[PDB]
Amino acid sequence: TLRAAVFDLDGVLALPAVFGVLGRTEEALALPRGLLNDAFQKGGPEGATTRLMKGEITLSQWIPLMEENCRKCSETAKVCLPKNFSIKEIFDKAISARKINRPMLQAALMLRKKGFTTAILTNTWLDDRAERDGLAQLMCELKMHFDFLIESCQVGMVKPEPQIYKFLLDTLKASPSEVVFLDDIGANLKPARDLGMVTILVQDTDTALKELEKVTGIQLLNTPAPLPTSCNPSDMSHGYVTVKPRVRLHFVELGSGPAVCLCHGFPESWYSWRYQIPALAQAGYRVLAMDMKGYGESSAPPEIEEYCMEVLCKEMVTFLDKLGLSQAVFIGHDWGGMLVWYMALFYPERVRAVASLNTPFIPANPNMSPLESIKANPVFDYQLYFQEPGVAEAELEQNLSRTFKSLFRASDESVLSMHKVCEAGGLFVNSPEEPSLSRMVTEEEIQFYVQQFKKSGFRGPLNWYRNMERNWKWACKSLGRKILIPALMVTAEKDFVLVPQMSQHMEDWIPHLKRGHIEDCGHWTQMDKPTEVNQILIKWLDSDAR
Amino acid sequence: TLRAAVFDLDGVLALPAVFGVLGRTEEALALPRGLLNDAFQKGGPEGATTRLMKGEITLSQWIPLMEENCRKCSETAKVCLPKNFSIKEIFDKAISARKINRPMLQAALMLRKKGFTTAILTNTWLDDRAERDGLAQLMCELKMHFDFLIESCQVGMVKPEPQIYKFLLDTLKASPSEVVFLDDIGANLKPARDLGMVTILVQDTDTALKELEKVTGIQLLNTPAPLPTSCNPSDMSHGYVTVKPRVRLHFVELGSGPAVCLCHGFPESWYSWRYQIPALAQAGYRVLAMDMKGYGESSAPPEIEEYCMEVLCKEMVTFLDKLGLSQAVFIGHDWGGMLVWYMALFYPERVRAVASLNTPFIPANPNMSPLESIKANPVFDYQLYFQEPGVAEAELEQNLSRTFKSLFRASDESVLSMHKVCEAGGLFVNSPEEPSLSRMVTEEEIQFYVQQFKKSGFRGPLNWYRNMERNWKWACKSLGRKILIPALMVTAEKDFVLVPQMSQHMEDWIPHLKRGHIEDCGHWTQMDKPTEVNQILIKWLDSDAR
Ligand SMILES: CN(CCO)c1ccc(Br)cn1
Ligand SMILES: CN(CCO)c1ccc(Br)cn1
Ligand SMILES: CN(CCO)c1ccc(Br)cn1
Numbered sequence A, B: 001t002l003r004a005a006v007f008d009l010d011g012v013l014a015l016p017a018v019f020g021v022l023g024r025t026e027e028a029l030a031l032p033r034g035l036l037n038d039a040f041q042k043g044g045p046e047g048a049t050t051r052l053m054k055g056e057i058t059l060s061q062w063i064p065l066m067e068e069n070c071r072k073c074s075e076t077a078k079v080c081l082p083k084n085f086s087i088k089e090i091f092d093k094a095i096s097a098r099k100i101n102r103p104m105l106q107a108a109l110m111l112r113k114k115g116f117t118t119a120i121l122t123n124t125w126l127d128d129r130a131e132r133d134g135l136a137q138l139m140c141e142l143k144m145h146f147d148f149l150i151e152s153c154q155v156g157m158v159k160p161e162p163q164i165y166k167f168l169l170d171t172l173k174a175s176p177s178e179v180v181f182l183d184d185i186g187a188n189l190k191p192a193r194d195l196g197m198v199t200i201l202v203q204d205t206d207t208a209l210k211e212l213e214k215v216t217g218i219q220l221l222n223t224p225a226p227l228p229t230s231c232n233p234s235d236m237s238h239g240y241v242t243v244k245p246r247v248r249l250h251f252v253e254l255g256s257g258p259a260v261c262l263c264h265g266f267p268e269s270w271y272s273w274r275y276q277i278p279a280l281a282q283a284g285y286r287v288l289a290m291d292m293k294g295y296g297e298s299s300a301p302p303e304i305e306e307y308c309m310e311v312l313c314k315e316m317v318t319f320l321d322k323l324g325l326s327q328a329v330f331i332g333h334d335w336g337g338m339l340v341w342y343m344a345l346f347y348p349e350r351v352r353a354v355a356s357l358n359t360p361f362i363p364a365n366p367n368m369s370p371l372e373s374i375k376a377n378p379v380f381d382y383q384l385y386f387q388e389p390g391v392a393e394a395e396l397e398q399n400l401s402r403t404f405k406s407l408f409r410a411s412d413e414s415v416l417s418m419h420k421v422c423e424a425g426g427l428f429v430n431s432p433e434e435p436s437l438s439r440m441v442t443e444e445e446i447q448f449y450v451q452q453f454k455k456s457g458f459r460g461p462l463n464w465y466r467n468m469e470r471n472w473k474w475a476c477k478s479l480g481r482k483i484l485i486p487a488l489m490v491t492a493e494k495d496f497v498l499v500p501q502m503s504q505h506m507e508d509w510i511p512h513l514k515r516g517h518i519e520d521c522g523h524w525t526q527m528d529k530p531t532e533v534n535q536i537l538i539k540w541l542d543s544d545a546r
């Protein structure tokens, strides 16, 4: 029985095959059939191309040698290559045209999800072209999804040489009959077959996946749409910035391009953005996913006033100063969404663009106490329960697994009221001791939050709600302002606390406001609807953030 | 006696004054004299500009109000503003034209170096213009050199209001007579004077500095050229990446733009790049200053083979993979310079460009043992002394302060032979027990290296020299290759081990090689000649790295 799946890159994990353009170039130029494919493979094992694939020479060194072979072939065929024939132009164009074969990658992802060891075995080259970054990017995106990447130019061996297959089996730590091997070249398939490996000759992807599905007994074709790539905490770059003597902020960092600072809500973590981090980095951004003050690896001082909006915002500005960033786009959810609007109001020069999930922008009412305002809305009762220091901490810290399992639920899975929490005497009063696991989360993901909250607990996080007066007084200073920088408001249909309707007058204070709306989405937006959130954020970032 | 110096921004720390363009715009357009300056200050404390400076409104909201004032003033003057009059265009142009007043900043730097508390007190605005980043960058560069930055739009007060001065004194924790206050506006100087502060009306910088020099008794004018900005380790962003189960790599990160990976030599630290990090980040690059494997906060496994070039290079590739970087420019010095050439030879697709300080590229000789090659050069005797595990560790770890003080010396300050080290029986045999402190380093900087080396000592670092055979065998695989990616070789006249002459045949293997040469420079290039290194690196990065 199989337990390993090996994939070729060209014509298998990536399409159109860079190789298949030789035939297209031949036809486009009306060159004799197979001329370019013939010059490419000239001299076989002793030839220029084999030396390139074994890593003896670089792609830029190979280019003049391929030109020489093209001439010799044309001389023999008694044809003339055109006046403006260029190998570099042809190969630049072909490499740039090559894309990941999404359905093939999804099958590799599904196999690996089921316990398969996966690898990419490719005949490739050391690319030193001025345009090499395009290929570097493609390989980067692809390789992260596999246990191994075996490149001919790095191992000094090539398919179809039998040694590369013995090397592959050694790397996989598997006997040949345990391996399914996919390749678009019959000649490169033959040694794997001769070894007794299961082999699939790849022509069209769907037939190749049908063969793969039959041989593995795992459904790979016609499967439900998969979730976006998540984060493994131990595989991320972890950053730490001291913003002041007793406060340090922790963040996870991924990608290159414009800085995108992600700001979670209550009671969350940088990990609440697990589905957004890989997607936004892949979209061309440098993601900085915060552990907000009071959370995870960031400092959690006990004082209530350390958590007022003015202090939190000042610290996020220091955070940018220390990292040497003049701006960042700020994207927040829940309490993070609130912080992000205040960053736009008080520090617009440091805010490239601003986006909030669920949290609307509502200006402070100077004629009403914030406690009066909270009292007027029944769904905000939990906020009054959070006021008294120690009360909500004791309940929320009593059983961490129960806390997160009760909180992190989709709109059709609640066990939690949110109204009459004070009268009831607690958040989990009518709650099971052993809540069922939400479809949104795995047990492992819940345990991650449990482990993070063991460090500082709920004091710092609850302190975000204990600055209503202070926040109101500070917010009143911004009453004559408008948000005129690029802004996005994302509403969640089924957030029964931060209801879409509460964002209805935002255009009065943000005239150029752009919107996104997510149907059948509860409070935990990022994990409830990650695909939709990623789609909305990437589209808005590319159009309005640069 | 003075102990604090306060500087205005517009017309003092930054020139030309954004304000002084109103007069220039008036003349360029042949508008009545003072018309634009008059519309700008219209309504005084109750006017649009004061509201902007107090942070009541943003710059984009102020623009239409200034236009309205410009019209009213022109109506009264009985003039017509031209057909195409735009406040936005004028102010965008003026802000963009404004630069740091380098001699004023240098005086502020010198005062602070002498124990002065320094601050910037400015009447400024909340900039939400599409072009706001230019100003954000300028403020970022400037503020890092001061103890405080007090912005009118953030404090809700403006000069000349007396409250802002009381606020300034409070922030400084100083009585007025202890403060020297510099401003280009006589009206904004008057309240500070009325308080009894020493005040300087700034017209031309040189006279203002002459006044400042007289009042403080500190030489600020005609001083020797200062060293580039250094790094305070506690103020940096520290990054950590696990490259494999037992190996994690630590780095310091600063700036935005193309990734520039700095690779130190033996026996150094990320801190060896202290003078390059702020300069390269200011030049428009994202600097990643490594603690190479075996050093500082990076892992230091004991096994010799963990330090061969192949393993070290594979790990630097994993390092880029985990950070999500398809490429980085690699700049190395000494052993780091050696690694960087091998990154270019084996991983050109991951190397944007390559630069080495002192370390030449010399291809492996397949007809001679590497030990034979080392033996042939008398200056490389120390490398034979380093071979025997434990011998050099015991000597180098015996007294860390003595080790670094003996090693880190300019070409005219040696206490260290380097040849006949084996025959002598040690590196420090003819060395003082208490070496004098080199002009290159402070006691504090030496103590930083001492503290870093207390964690893992010299085993890992010395292991870089214990892989001669392994490195030679691996290097021989690259004998048919050429380095064709952008490359820079920087030679140091007085490096008596890595002599400029050893780089003479590099063009045979790197045909497009660019060069830099530093006169009167010893082995410790980055700290010996930081200004020159920064100049060479920035020029090459801007021309060849993007
Ligand atoms: C804002 N958070 C805090 C309440 O615990 C939140 C979480 C769950 C739901 Br449901 C609504 N709001
Ligand atoms: C973000 N929500 C937090 C809901 O838990 C919020 C924002 C501002 C105020 Br006031 C109250 N709630
Ligand atoms: C390469 N390092 C190691 C020698 O200790 C080096 C340091 C000092 C001098 Br001087 C020359 N080379």
Ligand SMILES: CN(CCO)c1ccc(Br)cn1
Residues within 6 Å of the ligand: B266, B333, B334, B335, B336, B337, B338, B359
């Ligand atoms: C960089 N230098 C280290 C001098 O300490 C070097 C590089 C390669 C070989 Br082999 C020997 N020395």
